[PDB]
Design a protein around this ligand. Structure first.
Ligand SMILES: [Ca+2]
Ligand SMILES: [Ca+2]
Length: 700
């Protein structure tokens, strides 16, 4: 349980040096020395302490309060002192259902025991005395605004530990650095100490003492580090310097095109003449400073239907007909916080700006959460059809004849999704629960997050673009200057899980030098200036010295690949592609069996197989632009390149053992997706990469 009173335990006598900040479920406010391993022995002596929260009683009555050390205690119930350095029997009247503020201060110089043994009791009218039970105690209202029943500030009477933003973490800890450690029941927040915490691999937190959420998101610095937060929030965004917010795009998995019924045609019994294709969708980035969500859909160009007809020929579309599109999609959350009750609206766009459809889900009628690193619907469930089978009111996604031809030519669609994400599930200090709060909305949060953080977009996870935002100083905004300095190195560690085992920063085994850096213009000039000030000629050797600022944009990409203007991986150097195909497991006249890196496979559209005779002439076996999909990933994760698929199901016939079998890879950026202007559907002129070449006698 995360409920109870909030305690600050200080090594000094005057509430200045907080050693532990933690909560207690019951009136037992003790911290035994056995729980103090993350703090120096000499600091395990607590000379002062402050507790705060509320008391709720289940039964109106007159109660008497008392503690383990009334001679060292002053206690207030709603601004009223009930204990002052003396035990008493003064009976204060408490009404059922009503919430009373509690503040307790304790001071004792030169304690002879480490830790603190301290209990809060009360006695009712029937002379029954007990340690106050957990059902009667609540945390203070550590929010930016008071509740109707719970005031956000403690009584003005007595000591006030500096907590300028009311998040619960004392100013001094947020500025100087703190660590969070878990017991079995409780989280201790303590000052960072180099020689003890660094070796334990603990995380060193700093945050702004004047920003309740330092990332300007809806979860407080204290809520984050103490686990008083939506469990669906990404682990990295439990750091007060990492922004927690949703990021959504749409993934289209496949498409079906068909001819629209028309009033003039009474006949609806004709044969099916649809065009069904698989599609590949990637979230894009156009270095940029737009906070837009967009994804681009590539429609499969591989052979699907008999013949080499035009799409219009296939569907029987005349120049006056219209065509319809249906598709299967899912929503993808690549951000750091969940969505509960509004999915963002999406435009489906042909060419630069021809909106074909507006895709909307029903507000407050979501079938599940849309969680970070997850899909809606979940992958274990059917996807959403744009025109659902049940749904009478799904709008047809229609194209006129020329739009249809444009789609055939480009084989591309774009999905632009807005940033309307609905209500937020927040922590409630009254009951220690997380629930969707109707009074909290992502639209009130996103602008501030964007304005006060540096954005890093990184593709090291499967070459897909993942955006994170990290709290970073704005030298021009006084409030933002109260945040800790954020270095480029630290940002990569906390936002993306880079680590540094041997003084080299790595992402899952890959050195940082295996990725490039790309910035928007303002950011570029900023970083260039820093490097010059540092007398540094190479960014990779000074990542710990490069400071991020709010509104920076940083794009970091795997160096092995070529990228299009949407920053999607579309190719790779010849040398990289060749090497990636080096180790052959098996070869025969039936095909090749290779092990290919998963990332490499992502940028290949297909393979061309060829037999080269003794005079140097070449027979291309699968000699069509739509016949290059001859590779498949097997269960054992190896790739098979199938020579027979487009050889009429026959093994390669090699007339002479000195003939060669040549296999070439074709990257996405070099892929032909239409017949040439002259109508040629062959592979002639395709830019291709030789990846295997062996003579007949070397194959078998
Ligand atoms: Ca604070
Ligand atoms: Ca703070």
């Amino acid at each position: 349980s995360s409920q109870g009173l909030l305690g600050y335990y200080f090594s000094d006598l005057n509430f200045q040096a907080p050693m532990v900040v933690t909560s207690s479920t019951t009136g037992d406010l003790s911290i035994p020395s056995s729980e103090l391993e993350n703090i120096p022995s000499e600091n395990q002596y607590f000379q002062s302490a402050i507790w705060s929260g509320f008391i709720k009683v289940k039964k109106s009555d007159e109660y008497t309060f008392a503690t383990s050390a009334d001679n060292h205690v002053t206690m207030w119930v709603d601004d009223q002192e009930v204990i002052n350095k003396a035990s008493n029997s003064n009976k204060i009247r408490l009404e059922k259902g009503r919430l009373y503020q509690i503040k307790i201060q304790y001071q004792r110089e030169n304690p002879t025991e480490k830790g603190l043994d301290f209990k809060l009791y009360w006695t009712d009218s029937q002379n029954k005395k007990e340690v106050i039970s957990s059902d009667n105690l609540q945390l203070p209202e550590l929010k930016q605004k008071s509740s109707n029943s719970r005031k956000k500030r403690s009584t003005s009477a007595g000591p006030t530990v500096p907590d300028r933003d009311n998040d619960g973490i004392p100013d001094s800890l947020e500025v100087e650095g703190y660590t969070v450690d878990v017991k079995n029941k409780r989280t201790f927040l303590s000052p960072w100490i180099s020689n003890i915490h660094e070796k334990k691999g603990l995380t060193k937190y700093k945050s702004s003492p004047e920003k309740w959420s330092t990332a300007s998101d809806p979860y407080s610095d204290f809520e984050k580090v103490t686990g008083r937060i939506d469990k669906n929030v990404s682990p990295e965004a439990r750091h007060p310097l990492v922004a927690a917010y949703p990021i959504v795009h749409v993934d289209m998995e496949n498409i079906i095109l068909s001819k629209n019924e028309d009033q003039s045609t009474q006949n609806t019994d004709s044969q099916t003449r649809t065009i069904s294709k698989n599609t590949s969708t990637s979230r894009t980035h156009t270095a940029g400073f737009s906070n837009s969500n967009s994804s681009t859909v590539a429609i499969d160009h591989c052979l699907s239907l008999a013949g080499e007809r035009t799409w219009a020929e296939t569907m029987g579309l005349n120049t006056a007909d219209t065509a319809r599109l249906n598709a299967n999609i899912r929503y993808v959350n690549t951000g750091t916080a969940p969505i509960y009750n509004v999915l963002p609206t999406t435009s489906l766009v042909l060419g630069k700006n021809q909106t074909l459809a507006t895709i909307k889900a029903k507000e407050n009628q979501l079938s599940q959460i849309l969680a970070p690193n997850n899909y809606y619907p979940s992958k274990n469930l059917a996807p959403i059809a744009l025109n659902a089978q049940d749904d009478f009111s799904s709008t047809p996604i229609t194209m006129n004849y020329n739009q249809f031809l444009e789609l055939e030519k480009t084989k591309q669609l774009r999905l632009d999704t807005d940033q309307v994400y609905g209500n937020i599930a927040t922590y409630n200090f009254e009951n220690g629960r997380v629930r969707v709060d109707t009074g909290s909305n992502w639209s009130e949060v996103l602008p501030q997050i964007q304005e006060t953080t540096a954005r890093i977009i990184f593709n090291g996870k499967d070459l897909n673009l993942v955006e994170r935002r990290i709290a970073a100083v704005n030298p021009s905004d006084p409030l933002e200057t109260t945040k800790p300095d954020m270095t480029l190195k630290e940002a990569l560690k906390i936002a993306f899980g880079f680590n540094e085992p041997n003084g080299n920063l790595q992402y899952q085994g890959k050195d940082i030098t295996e990725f490039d850096f790309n910035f928007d213009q303002q950011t570029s000039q900023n970083i260039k200036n820093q490097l010059a000030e540092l007398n540094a000629t190479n960014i990779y050797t000074v990542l710990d010295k490069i400071k991020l600022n709010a509104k920076m944009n940083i794009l970091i990409r795997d160096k092995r690949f070529h990228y299009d203007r949407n920053n999607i991986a579309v190719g790779a150097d010849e040398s990289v592609v060749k090497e990636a195909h080096r180790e052959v497991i098996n070869s025969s006249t039936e095909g090749l069996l290779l092990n290919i890196d998963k990332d490499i496979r992502k940028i290949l559209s297909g393979y061309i197989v060829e037999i080269e005779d003794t005079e140097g002439l070449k027979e291309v076996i699968n000699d069509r632009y739509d016949m290059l999909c001859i590779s498949s990933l097997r269960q054992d994760g190896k790739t098979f390149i199938d020579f027979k698929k487009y050889n009429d199901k026959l093994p390669l016939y090699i007339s002479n053992p000195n003939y060669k079998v040549n296999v070439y890879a074709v990257t996405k950026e070099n892929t032909i997706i239409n017949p040439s202007e002259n109508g040629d559907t062959s592979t002639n002129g395709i830019k291709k990469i030789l990846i295997f070449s062996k003579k007949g006698y070397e194959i078998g």
